[PDB]
Short mmCIF file of all heavy atoms in Angstrom, two decimals:
data_model
loop_
_atom_site.label_atom_id
_atom_site.label_comp_id
_atom_site.label_asym_id
_atom_site.label_seq_id
_atom_site.Cartn_x
_atom_site.Cartn_y
_atom_site.Cartn_z
N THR V 76 107.56 103.10 83.50
CA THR V 76 107.47 104.09 84.52
C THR V 76 108.83 104.15 85.27
O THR V 76 109.23 105.23 85.72
CB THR V 76 106.31 103.80 85.47
OG1 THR V 76 105.11 103.95 84.75
CG2 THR V 76 106.34 104.82 86.63
N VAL V 77 109.55 103.07 85.44
CA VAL V 77 110.89 103.09 86.00
C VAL V 77 111.84 103.87 85.15
O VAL V 77 112.48 104.84 85.64
CB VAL V 77 111.41 101.65 86.21
CG1 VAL V 77 112.85 101.73 86.75
CG2 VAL V 77 110.58 100.92 87.18
N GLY V 78 111.93 103.54 83.82
CA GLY V 78 113.09 104.01 83.10
C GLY V 78 112.92 104.29 81.60
O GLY V 78 113.92 104.33 80.92
N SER V 79 111.73 104.42 81.10
CA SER V 79 111.65 104.74 79.67
C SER V 79 111.95 106.24 79.48
O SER V 79 111.77 107.02 80.41
CB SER V 79 110.28 104.39 79.08
OG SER V 79 109.26 105.32 79.57
N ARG V 80 112.35 106.64 78.29
CA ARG V 80 112.82 108.00 78.06
C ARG V 80 111.69 109.00 78.25
O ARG V 80 111.87 110.08 78.79
CB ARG V 80 113.42 108.13 76.64
CG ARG V 80 112.36 107.94 75.52
CD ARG V 80 113.02 107.65 74.20
NE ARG V 80 111.98 107.49 73.21
CZ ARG V 80 112.16 107.20 71.95
NH1 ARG V 80 113.38 107.01 71.49
NH2 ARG V 80 111.11 107.04 71.12
N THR V 81 110.43 108.66 77.86
CA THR V 81 109.38 109.61 78.06
C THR V 81 108.57 109.38 79.32
O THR V 81 108.12 110.33 79.98
CB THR V 81 108.37 109.49 76.87
OG1 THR V 81 109.07 109.65 75.61
CG2 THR V 81 107.32 110.64 76.95
N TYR V 82 108.36 108.10 79.73
CA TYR V 82 107.41 107.83 80.82
C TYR V 82 108.09 107.43 82.12
O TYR V 82 107.46 107.07 83.07
CB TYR V 82 106.41 106.77 80.41
CG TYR V 82 105.83 107.12 79.06
CD1 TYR V 82 106.29 106.52 77.91
CD2 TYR V 82 104.81 108.11 78.98
CE1 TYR V 82 105.78 106.87 76.66
CE2 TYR V 82 104.31 108.44 77.72
CZ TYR V 82 104.74 107.84 76.61
OH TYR V 82 104.21 108.23 75.33
N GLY V 83 109.43 107.57 82.16
CA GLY V 83 110.20 106.95 83.19
C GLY V 83 110.78 107.95 84.18
O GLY V 83 111.16 109.06 83.80
N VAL V 84 110.86 107.52 85.48
CA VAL V 84 111.44 108.37 86.48
C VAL V 84 112.93 108.49 86.27
O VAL V 84 113.54 109.60 86.40
CB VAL V 84 111.13 107.89 87.87
CG1 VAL V 84 111.96 108.58 88.93
CG2 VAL V 84 109.64 107.89 88.19
N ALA V 85 113.61 107.37 85.98
CA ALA V 85 115.09 107.23 85.99
C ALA V 85 115.49 106.95 84.55
O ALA V 85 115.60 105.78 84.18
CB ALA V 85 115.58 106.20 86.96
N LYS V 86 115.65 107.99 83.76
CA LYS V 86 115.64 107.75 82.33
C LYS V 86 117.00 107.20 81.79
O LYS V 86 117.02 106.90 80.58
CB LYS V 86 115.35 109.12 81.59
CG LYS V 86 113.95 109.64 81.90
CD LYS V 86 113.75 111.09 81.34
CE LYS V 86 112.42 111.64 81.88
NZ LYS V 86 111.28 110.89 81.46
N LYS V 87 117.99 107.04 82.59
CA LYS V 87 119.21 106.42 82.14
C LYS V 87 119.49 105.12 82.90
O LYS V 87 120.62 104.62 82.72
CB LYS V 87 120.38 107.37 82.24
CG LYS V 87 120.22 108.56 81.30
CD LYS V 87 120.08 108.06 79.86
CE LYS V 87 120.79 108.97 78.85
NZ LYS V 87 120.04 109.04 77.55
N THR V 88 118.58 104.55 83.63
CA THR V 88 118.90 103.39 84.42
C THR V 88 118.86 102.17 83.47
O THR V 88 118.31 102.24 82.37
CB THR V 88 117.88 103.20 85.55
OG1 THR V 88 118.43 102.35 86.52
CG2 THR V 88 116.58 102.65 85.04
N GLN V 89 119.50 101.08 83.90
CA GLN V 89 119.38 99.81 83.20
C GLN V 89 118.18 99.01 83.73
O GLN V 89 117.92 99.03 84.98
CB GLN V 89 120.62 98.98 83.37
CG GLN V 89 121.87 99.49 82.61
CD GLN V 89 121.71 99.36 81.07
OE1 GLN V 89 121.99 100.27 80.36
NE2 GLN V 89 121.24 98.22 80.61
N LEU V 90 117.39 98.40 82.83
CA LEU V 90 116.22 97.67 83.26
C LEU V 90 116.41 96.17 82.99
O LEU V 90 116.77 95.79 81.88
CB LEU V 90 114.97 98.15 82.54
CG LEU V 90 114.70 99.66 82.75
CD1 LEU V 90 113.87 100.28 81.58
CD2 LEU V 90 114.05 99.82 84.05
N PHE V 91 116.24 95.34 84.01
CA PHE V 91 116.36 93.92 83.89
C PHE V 91 114.99 93.28 84.15
O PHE V 91 114.44 93.43 85.27
CB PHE V 91 117.43 93.38 84.86
CG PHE V 91 118.78 93.97 84.59
CD1 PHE V 91 119.45 94.58 85.68
CD2 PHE V 91 119.36 93.98 83.35
CE1 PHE V 91 120.72 95.12 85.48
CE2 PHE V 91 120.61 94.58 83.14
CZ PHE V 91 121.28 95.15 84.17
N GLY V 92 114.51 92.54 83.17
CA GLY V 92 113.22 91.91 83.26
C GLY V 92 113.39 90.49 83.83
O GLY V 92 114.19 89.75 83.34
N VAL V 93 112.55 90.21 84.83
CA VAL V 93 112.46 88.84 85.39
C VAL V 93 110.98 88.47 85.29
O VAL V 93 110.14 89.00 86.01
CB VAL V 93 112.90 88.80 86.92
CG1 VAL V 93 112.69 87.46 87.53
CG2 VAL V 93 114.34 89.24 86.97
N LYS V 94 110.70 87.52 84.41
CA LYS V 94 109.28 87.19 84.13
C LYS V 94 108.87 86.12 85.10
O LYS V 94 109.05 84.89 84.87
CB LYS V 94 109.12 86.79 82.69
CG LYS V 94 107.65 86.32 82.37
CD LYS V 94 107.49 86.22 80.86
CE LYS V 94 106.11 85.70 80.48
NZ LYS V 94 104.93 86.66 80.93
N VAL V 95 108.23 86.53 86.20
CA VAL V 95 107.68 85.57 87.15
C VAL V 95 106.18 85.41 87.02
O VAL V 95 105.61 84.48 87.63
CB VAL V 95 108.01 85.89 88.64
CG1 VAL V 95 109.51 85.92 88.86
CG2 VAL V 95 107.28 87.19 89.08
N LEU V 96 105.56 86.24 86.20
CA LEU V 96 104.15 86.19 85.96
C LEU V 96 103.83 85.76 84.53
O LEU V 96 104.52 86.25 83.62
CB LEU V 96 103.50 87.55 86.23
CG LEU V 96 103.80 88.19 87.60
CD1 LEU V 96 103.09 89.55 87.69
CD2 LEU V 96 103.24 87.26 88.70
N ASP V 97 102.87 84.87 84.35
CA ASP V 97 102.57 84.50 82.97
C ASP V 97 101.76 85.61 82.28
O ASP V 97 101.58 86.73 82.85
CB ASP V 97 101.80 83.18 82.92
CG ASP V 97 100.38 83.26 83.58
OD1 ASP V 97 99.78 84.33 83.59
OD2 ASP V 97 99.93 82.17 84.02
N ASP V 98 101.35 85.38 81.08
CA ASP V 98 100.81 86.50 80.29
C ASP V 98 99.40 86.96 80.61
O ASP V 98 98.99 88.02 80.16
CB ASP V 98 100.94 86.15 78.78
CG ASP V 98 102.41 86.08 78.31
OD1 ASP V 98 103.26 86.72 78.96
OD2 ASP V 98 102.71 85.48 77.29
N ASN V 99 98.64 86.15 81.36
CA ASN V 99 97.54 86.67 82.26
C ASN V 99 98.03 87.27 83.59
O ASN V 99 97.19 87.47 84.50
CB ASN V 99 96.41 85.68 82.63
CG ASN V 99 95.57 85.34 81.44
OD1 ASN V 99 95.54 84.21 80.95
ND2 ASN V 99 94.65 86.44 81.03
N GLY V 100 99.29 87.61 83.79
CA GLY V 100 99.63 88.36 84.98
C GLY V 100 99.56 87.56 86.25
O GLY V 100 99.64 88.14 87.37
N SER V 101 99.42 86.24 86.18
CA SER V 101 99.43 85.40 87.36
C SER V 101 100.74 84.62 87.44
O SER V 101 101.43 84.37 86.49
CB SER V 101 98.26 84.42 87.25
OG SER V 101 98.47 83.41 86.29
N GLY V 102 101.13 84.26 88.72
CA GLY V 102 102.31 83.54 89.00
C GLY V 102 102.15 82.75 90.32
O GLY V 102 101.67 83.29 91.30
N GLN V 103 102.55 81.51 90.36
CA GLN V 103 102.59 80.70 91.54
C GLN V 103 103.58 81.30 92.49
O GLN V 103 104.54 81.96 92.12
CB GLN V 103 103.04 79.28 91.25
CG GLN V 103 101.97 78.51 90.57
CD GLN V 103 100.83 78.24 91.50
OE1 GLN V 103 101.03 77.68 92.64
NE2 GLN V 103 99.61 78.65 91.13
N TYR V 104 103.34 81.06 93.84
CA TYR V 104 104.20 81.92 94.61
C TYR V 104 105.66 81.41 94.64
O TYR V 104 106.59 82.18 94.85
CB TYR V 104 103.89 82.21 96.08
CG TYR V 104 102.67 82.97 96.48
CD1 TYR V 104 102.90 83.59 97.67
CD2 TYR V 104 101.84 83.62 95.55
CE1 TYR V 104 102.10 84.62 98.19
CE2 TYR V 104 100.87 84.48 96.04
CZ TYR V 104 101.10 85.07 97.39
OH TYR V 104 100.28 86.08 98.00
N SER V 105 105.82 80.11 94.44
CA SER V 105 107.09 79.49 94.37
C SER V 105 107.92 80.06 93.24
O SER V 105 109.15 80.32 93.29
CB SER V 105 107.02 78.00 94.32
OG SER V 105 106.20 77.63 93.27
N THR V 106 107.29 80.35 92.11
CA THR V 106 107.95 80.97 90.97
C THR V 106 108.36 82.43 91.39
O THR V 106 109.50 82.88 91.13
CB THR V 106 107.12 80.99 89.75
OG1 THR V 106 106.90 79.62 89.30
CG2 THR V 106 107.81 81.72 88.61
N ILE V 107 107.50 83.17 92.07
CA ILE V 107 107.81 84.51 92.44
C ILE V 107 108.98 84.52 93.48
O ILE V 107 109.85 85.38 93.35
CB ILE V 107 106.53 85.20 93.06
CG1 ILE V 107 105.51 85.50 91.93
CG2 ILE V 107 106.85 86.49 93.74
CD1 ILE V 107 104.12 85.79 92.44
N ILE V 108 108.96 83.53 94.34
CA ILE V 108 110.00 83.44 95.35
C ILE V 108 111.35 83.13 94.61
O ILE V 108 112.41 83.72 94.91
CB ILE V 108 109.73 82.38 96.42
CG1 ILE V 108 108.70 82.91 97.40
CG2 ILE V 108 111.03 81.99 97.17
CD1 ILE V 108 108.02 81.83 98.22
N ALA V 109 111.35 82.20 93.68
CA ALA V 109 112.53 81.90 92.90
C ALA V 109 113.07 83.08 92.13
O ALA V 109 114.28 83.34 92.10
CB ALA V 109 112.31 80.71 91.96
N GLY V 110 112.20 83.86 91.57
CA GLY V 110 112.61 85.06 90.83
C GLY V 110 113.24 86.08 91.76
O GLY V 110 114.22 86.76 91.39
N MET V 111 112.79 86.16 93.01
CA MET V 111 113.39 87.11 93.94
C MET V 111 114.77 86.65 94.32
O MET V 111 115.71 87.44 94.32
CB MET V 111 112.44 87.26 95.13
CG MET V 111 111.33 88.27 94.96
SD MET V 111 110.50 88.47 96.54
CE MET V 111 108.78 88.18 96.12
N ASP V 112 114.89 85.40 94.66
CA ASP V 112 116.20 84.81 94.91
C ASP V 112 117.08 84.90 93.67
O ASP V 112 118.29 85.09 93.78
CB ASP V 112 116.06 83.38 95.37
CG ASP V 112 115.51 83.29 96.79
OD1 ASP V 112 116.21 83.75 97.75
OD2 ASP V 112 114.32 82.88 96.99
N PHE V 113 116.50 84.80 92.49
CA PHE V 113 117.29 85.01 91.22
C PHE V 113 117.95 86.43 91.28
O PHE V 113 119.16 86.55 91.00
CB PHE V 113 116.43 84.88 90.01
CG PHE V 113 117.17 85.22 88.72
CD1 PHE V 113 117.98 84.34 88.16
CD2 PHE V 113 117.05 86.49 88.26
CE1 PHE V 113 118.69 84.70 87.00
CE2 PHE V 113 117.80 86.91 87.13
CZ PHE V 113 118.57 85.98 86.51
N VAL V 114 117.19 87.41 91.61
CA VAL V 114 117.72 88.74 91.55
C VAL V 114 118.83 89.00 92.60
O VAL V 114 119.81 89.66 92.32
CB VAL V 114 116.57 89.78 91.79
CG1 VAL V 114 117.14 91.23 91.82
CG2 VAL V 114 115.57 89.66 90.68
N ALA V 115 118.68 88.39 93.73
CA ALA V 115 119.63 88.55 94.83
C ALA V 115 120.98 88.01 94.38
O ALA V 115 122.03 88.54 94.81
CB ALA V 115 119.17 87.89 96.12
N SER V 116 121.00 86.98 93.49
CA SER V 116 122.24 86.43 92.96
C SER V 116 122.65 87.12 91.68
O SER V 116 123.87 87.47 91.51
CB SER V 116 122.12 84.94 92.72
OG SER V 116 123.35 84.44 92.21
N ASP V 117 121.70 87.38 90.79
CA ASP V 117 121.97 87.94 89.50
C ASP V 117 122.60 89.28 89.49
O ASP V 117 123.34 89.68 88.59
CB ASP V 117 120.70 87.91 88.64
CG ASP V 117 121.00 88.35 87.21
OD1 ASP V 117 121.68 87.65 86.51
OD2 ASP V 117 120.55 89.52 86.87
N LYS V 118 122.29 90.08 90.52
CA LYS V 118 122.87 91.42 90.63
C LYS V 118 124.38 91.29 90.63
O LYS V 118 125.10 92.33 90.21
CB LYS V 118 122.39 92.17 91.81
CG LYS V 118 122.85 91.60 93.15
CD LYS V 118 122.41 92.52 94.25
CE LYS V 118 123.24 92.26 95.49
NZ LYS V 118 122.96 90.91 96.00
N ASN V 119 124.97 90.21 91.12
CA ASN V 119 126.45 89.99 91.06
C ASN V 119 126.89 89.71 89.66
O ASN V 119 128.11 89.52 89.46
CB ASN V 119 126.78 88.90 92.00
CG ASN V 119 126.48 89.25 93.42
OD1 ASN V 119 126.83 90.29 93.90
ND2 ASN V 119 125.81 88.29 94.11
N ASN V 120 126.05 89.52 88.68
CA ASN V 120 126.41 89.38 87.28
C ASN V 120 126.24 90.63 86.46
O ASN V 120 126.43 90.54 85.24
CB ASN V 120 125.59 88.26 86.71
CG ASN V 120 125.94 86.87 87.29
OD1 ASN V 120 127.10 86.67 87.57
ND2 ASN V 120 124.93 86.06 87.50
N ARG V 121 125.82 91.74 87.08
CA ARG V 121 125.47 92.92 86.36
C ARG V 121 126.41 94.07 86.85
O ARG V 121 126.92 94.03 87.99
CB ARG V 121 124.03 93.38 86.56
CG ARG V 121 123.03 92.34 86.31
CD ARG V 121 123.10 91.82 84.82
NE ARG V 121 122.41 90.53 84.81
CZ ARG V 121 122.25 89.75 83.73
NH1 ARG V 121 122.75 90.12 82.59
NH2 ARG V 121 121.56 88.61 83.86
N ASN V 122 126.55 95.05 86.00
CA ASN V 122 127.30 96.29 86.35
C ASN V 122 126.32 97.36 86.78
O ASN V 122 125.66 97.99 86.01
CB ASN V 122 128.18 96.72 85.19
CG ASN V 122 129.36 95.79 85.00
OD1 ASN V 122 130.20 95.63 85.86
ND2 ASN V 122 129.40 95.14 83.83
N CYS V 123 126.25 97.49 88.14
CA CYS V 123 125.34 98.48 88.78
C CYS V 123 126.14 99.24 89.84
O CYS V 123 125.86 99.15 91.03
CB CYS V 123 124.16 97.78 89.37
SG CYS V 123 123.45 96.60 88.28
N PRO V 124 127.17 99.96 89.43
CA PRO V 124 128.04 100.67 90.45
C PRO V 124 127.26 101.59 91.36
O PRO V 124 127.66 101.74 92.50
CB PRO V 124 129.03 101.47 89.63
CG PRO V 124 128.48 101.49 88.26
CD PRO V 124 127.64 100.34 88.07
N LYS V 125 126.12 102.11 90.86
CA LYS V 125 125.38 103.04 91.66
C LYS V 125 124.30 102.35 92.51
O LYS V 125 123.68 103.01 93.35
CB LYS V 125 124.70 104.14 90.82
CG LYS V 125 125.72 105.02 90.05
CD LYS V 125 126.74 105.59 91.06
CE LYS V 125 127.63 106.60 90.32
NZ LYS V 125 128.57 107.33 91.18
#
Side-chain angles (χ1 to χ4, degrees):
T76 295
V77 174
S79 68
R80 67 197 179 183
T81 307
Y82 310 101
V84 169
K86 296 173 191 296
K87 295 303 217 213
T88 198
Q89 288 293 135
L90 303 153
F91 301 126
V93 176
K94 178 167 174 65
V95 300
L96 302 181
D97 68 26
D98 291 335
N99 292 114
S101 73
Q103 288 291 306
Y104 294 209
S105 53
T106 297
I107 289 166
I108 286 162
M111 274 188 232
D112 289 293
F113 173 81
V114 175
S116 182
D117 183 66
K118 67 175 202 294
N119 298 311
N120 294 321
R121 308 300 163 184
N122 285 302
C123 312
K125 296 307 187 178

